[PDB]
Amino acid sequence: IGMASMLDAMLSRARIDARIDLESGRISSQDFSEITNTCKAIEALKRQ
Amino acid sequence: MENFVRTNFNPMILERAEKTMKEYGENPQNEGNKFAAISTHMEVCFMYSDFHFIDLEGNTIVKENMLKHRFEIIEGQERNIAWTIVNSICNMTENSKPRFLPDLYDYKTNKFIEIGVTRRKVEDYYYEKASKLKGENVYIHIFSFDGEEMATDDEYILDEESRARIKTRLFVLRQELATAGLWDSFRQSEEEEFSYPPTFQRLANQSLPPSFKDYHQFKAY
Amino acid sequence: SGMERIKELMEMVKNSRMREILTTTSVDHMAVIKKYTSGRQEKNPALRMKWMMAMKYPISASSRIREMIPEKDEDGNTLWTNTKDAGSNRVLVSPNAVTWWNRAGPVSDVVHYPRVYKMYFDRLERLTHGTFGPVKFYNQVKVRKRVDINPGHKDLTSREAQEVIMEVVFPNEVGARTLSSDAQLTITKEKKEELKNCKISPIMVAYMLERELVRRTRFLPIAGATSSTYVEVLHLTQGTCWEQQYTPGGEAENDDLDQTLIIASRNIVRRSIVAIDPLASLLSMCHTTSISSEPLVEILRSNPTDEQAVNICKAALGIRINNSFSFGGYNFKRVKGSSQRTEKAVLTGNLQTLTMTIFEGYEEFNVSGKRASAVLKKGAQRLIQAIIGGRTLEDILNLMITLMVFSQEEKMLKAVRGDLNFVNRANQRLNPMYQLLRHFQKDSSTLLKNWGTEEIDPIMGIAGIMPDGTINKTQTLMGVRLSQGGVDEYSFNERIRVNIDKYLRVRNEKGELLISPEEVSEAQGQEKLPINYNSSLMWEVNGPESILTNTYHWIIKNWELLKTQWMTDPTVLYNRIEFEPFQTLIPKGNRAIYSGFTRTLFQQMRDVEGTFDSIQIIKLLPFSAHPPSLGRTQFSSFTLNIRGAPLRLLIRGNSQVFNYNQMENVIIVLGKSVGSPERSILTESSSIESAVLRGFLILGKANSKYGPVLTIGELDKLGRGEKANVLIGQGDTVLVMKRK
Amino acid sequence: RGIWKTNSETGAQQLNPIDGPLPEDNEPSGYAQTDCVLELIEGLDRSHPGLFETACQETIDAIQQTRVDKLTQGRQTYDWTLNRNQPAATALANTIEVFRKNGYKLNESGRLIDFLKDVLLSFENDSMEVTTHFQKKKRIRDNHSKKMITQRTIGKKRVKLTKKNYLIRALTLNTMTKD
């Protein structure tokens, strides 16, 4: 279910998944930063 | 009002406010003071979290611009998105799951935060909010336009500068509601419909037993 | 780590059409665009598979087969071919590739099939270690009813099990809802610990858990046992004319055995009272009866079942009685008083006509089990006084709903709001007393303000409960108080000693009449396990539909023997023990009035020659299995209790119960052919009749040379030499003379 | 023997047999009497008290929680944007696409009743703009039978429906023979 778009749902899920993985020690800080910057690049495209 | 809110708040705050009003099924021009109150709640929820980081050593810092945020912002997102966030957090930190959707989550103190913004007294709305939220280990924080804020159990996890900046912004917004006159309607404002458009109304009028000229006359009969 | 999917999403967002779709389609609209199909629809897969298997390559598989399966068989078959495109991730595959993999592919040490499909291996273990008895041939009376094809978990319903499955398999996707049971929580923690480090796909895990936890039902025609392990072999165990005796492999279920012990107890109790020694027959039947191929008296020495008819079977043998009955699962133990049951036609709260069964008579109660206690003073439709106890404050509030359903006054029967159908979707009669129970559990505001208040005196040791949830010390509801310590244990949970007599009334060493046979609930449930009353006092399978057919089936084949007993010394014929289980279908006050009518009909067939109807002697004969009365009243039909519904049986002509068929030359009972009586139609089909009316002779069809018409009840003031026209029943009139 | 009228919106000839002359033989008739229908429904309500209210409450609870994708449960649906049958999910996706291209964005909430509000609001649109499947024919030679055949190539094309044409398509039931 949902009213947000598929892309917003995917980016929100990717951000919270990377944050929970960084809290649980299952990824590194560089991987967390690279996932968050990939999400910011996708949002830079999605703005246009 | 309408143009007051669109001249006073940031475009992202108004964007999330418009998306929130649309998700709850109401245009911003039909409810203008509710749009202003929603933009107020969103702006306080964003000033609670902006430039507030946790470093690699677990110590909260305040910046201007290799850091991770201290707060996860749950107010503003869609409802199932926010429940995905809340469920993932409750499954990592194995706590109880809140019954209502909160507004923030603090990773440092590991606590869900609820933010209220009032025009009335702080303590009455605070006790009604603590009665509505009775049964959960949330942290309530009520801010007012008057310049007072109430915490939960007189404990503070935010510092002095950020809370003073929130109260400064709320005092400036309250005085801005006075000079354009729209504080009388603001401070004193706290079902399904299905109509027929005119072409379908004429189609309805032509769909009856032959002794009826109106669909509503037949519905009354 | 999650970097690949965000890189792939970046790659897809860089395409313009994909970005427009991902930014304009919501999650709700993705359910619509997921099923978008623009080609022509493929129809007829049976015909298509018939001709596609003549081709070389009917199978489409992924391109990884090019690395796993060679292009050439040892026999020289081509196993796969590349498609007409260039960069397709899909190859066309011959079924010889499937045979090559099954004979020469990589052997795996890890197979997942016995864990995912553990339900079917449970089924095969039940069949392989099962035992077959003989096959008996008789008319199977199946009844269509809702049974379980998957038993599910006992602690869960279907929706609770689906929410447990979502919490176990996909815990971060459950949304707003939580798990609202402690049983859900324990099953969820158990399944989460069981399914750690599983390399199975999560959807297959979810379907495996649905095979384990979700209860499925279907409407099926069942003749025997209805537990879920006897329903899976329903194709093997029953047919239209035969029954295969089968015991499944393994240990039986406890709640299934607890139910079918009660049903087998009530049959043996109800059969026994229409014997000449109701104790010696009950002991003869209890020692031979078996449940799921296990003897009854070995079950009656280890079962904690507290029921009224079970207690007669134990007090006859010598097992000690834990005297209580169960509503809602609580021990409803009586103290003092005595009642008797007789149903009536009362009205309910949703304006529906209901046939309730209300216990008329004073009964003192000590109702207590596992959470609280209650001492209910109660008579006829009157909750007088209930000093109810508890352990926690909230568990008294739910048991307050429990007692006020059992009260059944003229207040709770008319304080029902909502929709409470006492029938189901197949017009099947649900029992009423459990339907008010499951309804008032969450709708309780109509049972707290219609009940009112009653004034009380300030005595210590007593608390109160208001309508609005207030504990009080000045006023409270009618007949309900609140205590603190209550009544202690080891007096309800002691199995006391008793003694039985010749007529099964169970009294203790003091002389409290604790069980009488008149207090046995005369309901016919369907059992979860089969019951073999291997006795000469019963029939093969019990049931009110089976007692009707088997009795008439026995008179028809023994008709050459029974007609001679009917002709001379007829009272030896009426006293047959084959005729005795038929009397459990007749109501109690109707038995002596029916035999007195029937034997009076049978005597007029003898004193008037030529009026011998062998088809009507057969029909009336198992209604004479009782000492008669001298009540000269007229009957047009005899009622018969089958599943609560009183079926009528007409003295003259066919019915839905006893239908003679001239075309087949047969008697049809309840839709089951029970055999040709004697085939003596030419000696039969007379004119004068004598076994329809009491003291009257039907003389042919209707004729108005004698005056007006009468009815069956209005023939009391007649005389000698006087004929008349009477509506005989079923839309016709006959000339009728009251004889000398 | 009923009344004939011309529809003001579609322009069609409509026959009204309701409350018509009572039949005088045993032929099939369509002259149903509205008062007798209302009397029978009133008797059904009288013999079943609380039936209509319970059923209406269940329908009210189900209206508010029904999504648009429930309409994808169907089989072959008449697609008014193509004047042809399509599968139900395809037909719904084409309808939602044409609606949101024309400014009917209530169905973006995902509830079925907002889609129904958009369906009723689209009849006021004076000019619908839909996407149609056209074809481009070309005479080629078949390579395995040496016979000149016609190559059909389907593309998309945007047309403008009128108000009456859209209203006729929105009330159109496509027909076929039951096999």
Add this chain to the structure above:
Amino acid sequence: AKSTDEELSYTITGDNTKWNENQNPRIFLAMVLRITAGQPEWFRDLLAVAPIMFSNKVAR
């Protein structure tokens, strides 16, 4: 069961001639409005749309 013994009982095995062609959407409109009597008027207007649309239908 709901019969006395002085009663004939006959069963019709019945079909109806041209069932769908002799039904009427205006009668369905009256049925829907009487079933939903005393209900919210948005609900009565929503449930009336399908008989109104079937009263004005065309057949391709």
Add this chain to the structure above:
RNA sequence: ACGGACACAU
């Protein structure tokens, strides 16, 4: 939940 097959009525 979704899909397929079959039956029946329209």
Add this chain to the structure above:
RNA sequence: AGUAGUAACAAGAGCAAUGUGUCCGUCUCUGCU
């Protein structure tokens, strides 16, 4: 011609509803003892 049957195929675009129930599943060849 033939299949067929209220209209078609005999090559040159293959037109599958609604409601209910039951059952199953989860992406260059032709050989039935």
